[PDB]
From a paper:
The sensorgrams had concentration dependent distortions in both the association and dissociation phases, with a negative slope at steady state and signals below baseline once the ligand injection was stopped. Surface Acoustic Wave (SAW) biosensor technology was used to confirm that distortions observed in SPR biosensor data for interactions between compounds VUF6105, VUF22430, and VUF24234, and AChBP indeed result from ligand-induced conformational changes. The three VUF compounds resulted in significant ΔSHG responses with all labelling variants, with VUF22430 giving very high signals. Similarly, VUF6105 resulted in a significant compaction, while VUF24234 resulted in an expansion. As seen from the different conformational changes induced by each compound, this analysis revealed that the binding modes of VUF6105 and VUF24234 are different. The unit cell was comprised of two or four pentamers of Ls-AChBP in the presence of FL1613, FL1856, FL1888, FL3044, VUF24234 and VUF6105. Notably, binding of FL1888, VUF24234 and VUF6105 results in a movement of the loop closer to the compound, while binding of FL1856, FL3044, FL1613 and FL1909 does not have the same effect. The violin plot revealed that conformational changes in loop C occurred to a higher degree in the AChBP structures with compounds FL1888, VUF24234 and VUF6105 than in the other structures. This correlated with the results from the SPR, SAW and SHG biosensor experiments, which all indicated conformational changes in AChBP upon binding of these compounds.
AChBPs are homopentameric, water-soluble homologs of the ligand-binding domain of LGICs and well-established structural surrogates for nicotinic acetylcholine receptors (nAChR). Importantly, AChBPs can bind nAChR-specific ligands and induce similar conformational changes as in the membrane bound receptors. LGICs are activated by ligands binding at subunit interfaces of their extracellular domains, thereby inducing conformational changes that affect the structure of a central pore and its ability to transport ions through the membrane. Additional density was found in all structures at the interface between the subunits in the orthosteric agonist and antagonist binding site, next to loop C in which the respective ligands could be modelled.
Author numbering:
A (entry chain I): 20 to 175, 181 to 225
B (entry chain H): 20 to 174, 181 to 224
C (entry chain G): 20 to 174, 181 to 223
D (entry chain J), G (entry chain B): 20 to 175, 181 to 223
E (entry chain F), F (entry chain A): 20 to 175, 181 to 224
H (entry chain E): 20 to 176, 181 to 223
I (entry chain C), J (entry chain D): 20 to 176, 181 to 224
Write the structure that this text describes.
């Protein structure tokens, strides 16, 4: 009916710890990094310090409601929802979340979470100061949910800060499948390739 | 009644997670930054470290009470209130809040919140050392509410005399953008901090 | 009562959100700093980084018990008490509290809170390497309680001898700040630390 | 049963404070470190700054369920499980967990927890600049559970970042134990020998 | 009882806010710091950064159980327990607690708590490069409880990293009892003297 | 959605004190009484003691779920439901509910509630002992909701016990609207006229 | 604000244990009985069993709201409300409430509560078979609140059952203020005289 | 696992509102009345007052546990358990439960519940003073769950009945039956208890 | 303080299960039955049905407050207080409490509970139609607290009784009884209430 | 420790649902009925209406406390203790509890629960008006706990019986007995209580 009713129900009945699997189909999560800033780099030790909006999308039908004559969408705290347990496998610091931890929810149950994160990665930074630029690959996927429970897909400069000493040449994202020695099941991930270089003046 | 009553009511009934949209009008949010100190500036990196009191105001009519023979206003923990999900879109460090997270509530339901924040920005440091100075732009709007739910409206006595820097000018302009994709319009306040290194 | 009873009472009924305003009188808070240590000072940037005990004191009658055959005071976690929402007006860093967050409550409802706080300020660092020394002023007052709600009044020997600086003098004085936007005055204590490098 | 049911059962009944000893025989924990990155090294101070994944396995029958027409495993927040109070004996910073604080629970009540941790150790960094390399020993055991209550055992390179300034010669992992003359009791540890060198 | 029952009991009935004074006698606390590492010394600023296990011990009879067919000892989170409010009166950083915040409660009501703490101190670091070394005094006490409510007492190197830049010559720990200028009462305290030096 | 899921969502949401009004329209409550037995009649006081199944119905849309691959209705404690505050205006004993207090909830949010009630009324019993027989009128409406808020409406001896001493000739149920002096708003009630006689 | 909000505010801040004394003065409670039935009379025992509507009315300002775009009234459970602690001083069984225990709150704070009660009294049944009839006095008053805290007032047959064997010749309601020897406080009651006879 | 833990888990995971349906098949409830006494009988009004033990038996897999070194069964208050919403169709007074409202849970999820009920009923008392006695049929079945959600059964088509009664029991037959009403598609399953008894 | 703060403080800190003993000195309970009606007597069976106000009075200084600029008294549900565990040893029905279960709490912590009770007793009804009347004896005291825990005392301090009863009250006297049995080192007390009544003419 | 702390400890860690079984030995429960009055008797229907005190004692170790400088006993509402689920097999009315529902607890975990109950039974009232009298047997045992879990034993087999009953008691014996049933393969234990009574003059 109203904003307050919609948020009450989601709070009271939403099960944060419960992956919203559908008929035991993997939950499909969309992920696209939108880089905003490159804040520090190190060709010697091979580290980068980035700021990026982690465009993260997925469906949770248990959230959906009868719009009809009611709010299009709502803003929900992420404590009040299930959220994918995503990790950047090659981060070497923990996500500084820069933004209000609110996710935007539509009446169908499709969810949009997009926090600004500042994080430090460990990646190939050789060629940063050349014209070829460097290509730093960030791998992201489910920390605890494997192929049959979570799958991850990428999607279809307008963001990047003009005051950065760096400039992006190209950013590309590939779905991937890894396996581990311990474990018979495979995990999926988005491989994000940031090609960037130091500016000329 | 009295304070304890007025504060019990707010705590028992306030719903932090519910924007108080009054009849499907947008919650008007008045914003005004007051810089207190500038601390680290880098014309190479175009990064800055600043401290400012973000003077914020809006109306949550649910909070209202009958002023007749009772407190004009009370102080309240912002965990007991709805608060707009403001974010600085060029911030490169999380906001570090320096002061007690309390806000003031007037009997008419006007909420008045003024945190002291320290945060780092990616902005134009070009010219800080010259006469006409640097102009650093800081953009502040709601992180999840487009212009039908929240609408942000911008409203030296505050700046430390002991700063290494000096403030030529601060100006505030609203900013609205529609896109091909999405029928909702988005708003931010644009804060132009024109400052320079003292003699 | 015993210590358990008295704490339980304070836990159940201390309205930790409610200024213990008496009639409509400002709650009269006393603040008096004692410096333990000056740790890093910048004359260029006008930034000092200091450690100090904030002696705070105020009365809350919802706390009091008849010290009849009872303890005359107890230790109360500040989560379970009303505390003045104080702030350093010229702090450039969030207070680092170095101590257990406990306050002493007297049977008459007198509270004595004294945290050890490490924090950096903007203030006049100049003259630090001179005999007459630098004079760094800190202001501490309520963040939200104007002057009809919370008054503030001010009341070397704890100062570390291993410091690189020394305190020539420390005066503390009643002050109020007002702003053109806002109808109300806010009381503080203006602490003048006169000190110099060794 | 389904994910939501199992999760609720685990949250309602799993007792995070209660070591799941069986027939008072010590709780068998496996700790197996996978080094991801070596980031800083100081041959003067004998300190390393390391990133590893800590494969921690044990067993808690009270989490178990009938997997007849149910999930093989589910994912549970460690706050809703008893976890081993493991601690690095020679650690010089707080463990910085970089990953979702979530563990995997098998229906037979076996728990699979692999946090990704950054932390500094005081250890032997000598020879790092050389072909045979330094050997940094890292010691991990229960902080409060002596060897009648917990044993730690190793499980009876490949993830290390190829963009590290360092590489790995050998990793060996051996059960050991320790006492302190203040106190009667002994504590099992796994001793992780990291044989590495600069590239 | 079993661990399950003993822990449920404590979680249900322990008052972490209530000092376990018995018959208006003070709580005897054994405190004894054991240094593991010395991470950073500055002879200019007079500062050390150190890591210590702070072996802490005291009696809280309300915790006791009859140990007949029962555990002799259990691992309780300290949030379930009253804990002495110990400070280090010349710390310049907050105590960085590095290990799981659990304590040991013996069936007779004895609480054994040993955190590993990283913390920075303001002390005399002159003569660390000498041979008889620097002597860094640290003052440990209750913040809010006087000697009538807490007495703090020490205990009579096996722990210090052999790979430290530095080495410990001696560590001694004596009782001190102190009276401030403001207030009538005394606070019992410990003095810890870290006599140590560089290696070469 | 399973029954487990739906029941959770109802218990947790759903506000038993919140009349399910739509667009400030009256909530339409249907009520058909089904007499099961007449256990006492008295022509002198004019009193009967009856048992009846009170077939009750109304929509509450905050209860609805999409029953795509899911159950069509569920059984729900009325303590977790709003229910109409119906009263017998001419009752002289309190309703003695004989049955489990569970109502049925269809996925379109229709509530089907039907308790077995025993209760005693003040009504015209004259000539229960003749062919044409007594006609005992029972008025039922909401105790606190007027017509704009609630409309109690009727619907249109498959229930009645073959071993009673009485037999039902007729039951008719007609809409009734009533205005009390105190209060200018009007209640919307149902007159149940029970036409029965002794069998002999 | 819709009903569902008003009812939520009431439940969370209605302090049903607290008498809404406004300022100094007592709470003014209107009580007026409406007899529906007389059911069993015993002139030997001086006993009567009676069904009556207890129209009750008072002001709790704490329930108040602004109806501009709001209902004027909602129905509230008395569990979530302060109710006057009324007792019929000459009752000899407990009140059997025959109706839902819901009261009615006006936006200006007035409450209207009107239960149908069956209850037996001790009173003057003599002459119930004569022309002039019997006059049963029923004395209703606060059980714990004396006259400084509660004053009762009536407000100047019509729902009586024609199918009763008795008939009301008259009903009159006056106020009375009674003091007992133990206790220096005066209590108020309404005394309702029920002039009825057998038809 | 002990009694204490088993009961904690049940308490803590209790969904009393969730019919424990397994893969959309109906929950099979057994009902057997074991008559203890007959307190009052009326051939005029066709009413009897009776005390019986109602043995009831169903599965609820959600309560189960591993019974290796664990109790075989435990005692659980019914407010923690889902219970069949059972009801007599011809009852004329509330069921007066005389015993502790406790059932027994077995390790496999079986729930055995047996309350003592005193209740009045409307039935065929004709012939109570004859050689072949009266045959009062009592009909018991779920009030709100139909054929597809609950199915009943008698496990029982001299050890219980009071030797001191004014009546003897000749026979009690219990048969699965069913009941539908024109209003409502779904059939309801019931147990048909024929109490054939006489005055001595 | 206002009434609202006092009731909040009582509700929040009150221990109904806890006898307010002061240093293991016993809680002094005053009792006084003021009879209102006598409703049924039976000389064959020695049974009476009666209604009385049972005035109870005790101290619980843990409920005190500062009367300074406050109310001297407030009403409190008894379900938030400790109450005397009083039983009538010769009752044959359970006590029907006819009145609101509220009590008065005075600012010195004095509690004043007076319920109107209706109960049937097994007592000496003989002589009821004579001029000396019957004397029916009712014994009242704690069910589980011996006399080092609760001391019951009659206040003995007609005005209350129905002018419409068939019966009339000739005198009421109340006296303390106390007994030591050999099993237990403890004396038990009771208050013996002697209702001397006769039928009216 | 004081009463407030013993009661608190009991309230919080008692486990009212959990039978205090030790070493899978039966819990030994001791019921002795003490008769206060006989109120109705009916020779036609074989029914009596009686009032009695149900003396019930057992041991529950989870209640115990060290009673040095402590109360040795406290009074505890039965909601906060495990209580045996006793019932009168041959009862025909609900138990009417006439007394405060408190139980007395000894620091060693010994419990006395003694409600005055009024109830009605089906029993042999034959011979009530003869000099030999009727022998009404009442059976009281655990509803749901068979013999391997609850064992039931009387103590001893006047001072209680009202002098004003129409009736008089001749003897009360009380005897261990065990009833078993077709359906269910465990035996229950009971105190069979033989009331031998008759009418007075
Ligand atoms: C006038 C600014 N202040 C002086 C001291 N306290 C602050 C304060 C406290 C609470 C609210 C506000 C404020 C001011 C303007 C707009 C919004 N809030 N300031
Ligand atoms: C007299 C109006 N009503 C019609 C049916 N219900 C009643 C009603 C309900 C709720 C409150 C009141 C009321 C209360 C005080 C005074 C008058 N009426 N009446």
């Amino acid at each position: 009916f109203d904003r307050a009713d919609i948020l009450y129900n989601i709070r009271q009945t939403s099960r944060p710890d419960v992956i919203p699997t559908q008929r035991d189909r993997p939950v499909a999560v969309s992920v696209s990094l939108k880089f905003i800033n490159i804040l520090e780099v190190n060709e010697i030790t091979n580290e980068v310090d980035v700021v990026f909006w982690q465009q993260t999308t997925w469906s949770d039908r248990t959230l959906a409601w009868n719009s009809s004559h009611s709010p299009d969408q709502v803003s929900v705290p992420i404590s009040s929802l299930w959220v994918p347990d995503l990790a950047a496998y090659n981060a070497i610091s923990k996500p500084e979340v820069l933004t209000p931890q609110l996710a935007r929810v539509v009446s169908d149950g499709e969810v949009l979470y997009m926090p600004s994160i500042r994080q430090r990665f460990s990646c190939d930074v050789s060629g940063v100061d050349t014209e070829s630029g460097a290509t730093c690959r960030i791998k992201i996927g489910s920390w605890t949910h494997h192929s049959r429970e979570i799958s991850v897909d990428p999607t279809t400069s307008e963001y990047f800060s003009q005051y950065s000493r760096f400039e992006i040449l190209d950013v590309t994202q590939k779905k991937n499948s890894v396996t581990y020695s311990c474990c018979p099941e495979a995990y999926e991930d988005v491989e994000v390739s940031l090609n960037f270089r130091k500016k000329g003046r």
